[PDB]
Amino acid sequence: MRTRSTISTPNGITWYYEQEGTGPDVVLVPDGLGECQMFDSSVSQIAAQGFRVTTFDMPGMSRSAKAPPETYTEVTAQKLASYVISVLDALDIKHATVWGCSSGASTVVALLLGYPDRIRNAMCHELPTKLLDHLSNTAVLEDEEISKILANVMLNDVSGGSEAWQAMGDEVHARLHKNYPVWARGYPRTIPPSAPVKDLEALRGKPLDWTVGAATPTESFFDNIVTATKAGVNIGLLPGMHFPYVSHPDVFAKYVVETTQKHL
Amino acid sequence: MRTRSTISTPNGITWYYEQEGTGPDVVLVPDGLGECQMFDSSVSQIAAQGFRVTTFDMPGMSRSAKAPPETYTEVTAQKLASYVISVLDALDIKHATVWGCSSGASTVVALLLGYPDRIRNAMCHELPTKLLDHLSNTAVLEDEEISKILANVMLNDVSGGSEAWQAMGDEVHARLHKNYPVWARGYPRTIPPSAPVKDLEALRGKPLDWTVGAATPTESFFDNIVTATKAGVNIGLLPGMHFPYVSHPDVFAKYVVETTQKHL
């Protein structure tokens, strides 16, 4: 049975969060779109294997909408790490495995480097380290233009599975609709430069498990592969593209469970 | 003026070849399909920067079909290297820059490792090191079966440009139509296990430049990127997928040219 609730942190944010299971703590950090309903199936599946799974909407997004402007504008890996620790403190989670994709990837590596007493191990997926122009330019269109565009980029270009992506239901898609403009203004310019991967020796020997989607164009995360190899971090693939927890939940859950037992 | 002629080697192969320009020798080795008309506009383009460019259909393929079965069955990288060195000998090319994709990439790395006095530098693209069941399984089918399947794969899966692919002409595809069965019986099972890249240390410090196609699914050549990075080999991208010299002639020609110039 799943806890669905909110909890407030002193930095101004009222997080919407969900929790299921008992055992060691596993925390699933959303990608830039901030919507934790993307993990629904997995939350249960990873729970059933002996974990306490927690997740949440990111600040400014979906049901964690109530937050001060600094939390969803000029967003950096460091800012977001800072916010995730605060919801972990509030929910009294002392040690966690953490998973994260895209800006969630950036945050989890930053949690790992910045709070090693707190992080049992970190899974990072498709960490963005380059400024992408086509997405940057959308931050000056009308909110409703942005949503139509980004909804479409998600659906056809990076979802890694359009059936699955679309099967998330109308409510999810209604919340994403609101998130797209917020994301577009706050994330694309400031997340990539903040990537905590430039210092190779900080990475070395840390419990970190890096993946990229098997069907993503090689161009997209080529740098991820080079960085992980140079720093001896394990690097592999998941089926799909930018959202393996949406396109391939069963394999995603198995992977999280399996990597967690490894460091357990 | 392009020479378009035939030359014979004492290993029983009568090679169809083409040569253009004047200058330090650059040799463009085809991929498994063994069809050098794929290089046509780039031959011109490269030669026009001060190079003799030589290319050739591969043994058993296209207009090089007059060869003994050993040259096109149980094919391995070391064997193709041997054949190439022999046509080089016939053409009195003592020192060459070499490009090769796919089985052509294994070949050029094998040329570089095995004959360092002959190879000035080597460019390799999308080097196969993993078996691919579904291409492998085609070998048992009837000739016409194989051609329909593989031609379709070339066109829609890995060309990186279906328009450019089809624009090769009816002649090219008629010769490719014949090569498919030959390639399926001869190459997929034996080429990957002969990949000359299991010895990372032997690649360290070599004049070798490795690329993967920007648009290729990440899973296809992830291992190239890992290997190149572990061995300190320059790795990077070219636009397209498996056939940059068909889909992006201009970038291909310039890349060959810059990289060769780097080694004069």
From Swiss-Prot, chains A, B:
Entry's EC annotation: 3.1.1.-
Pfam family, one: Abhydrolase_1
Impact after mutating H134A: Retains about 70% catalytic activity
Keyword match Hydrolase: yes
Presence of keyword Hydrolase: yes
pH dependency: Optimum pH is 9.5.
Ranges for domain AB hydrolase-1: 27-207
UniProt keyword list: Detoxification, Hydrolase
Enzyme class, first EC level, given as a word: hydrolase
Stored InterPro entries: AB_hydrolase, AB_hydrolase_1, AB_hydrolase_fold
Effect of E126A: Abolishes the catalytic activity
Gene Ontology BP terms: response to toxic substance
Binding site for zearalenone: G32, S102, S103, W183, Y187, S220, H242
One of the record's GO molecular function terms: hydrolase activity
Result when mutating H242A: Strongly reduces the catalytic activity
Active-site residues (renumbered): S102, E126, H242
Family, per entry: Belongs to the AB hydrolase superfamily. Hydrolase RutD family.
UniProt protein name: Zearalenone hydrolase
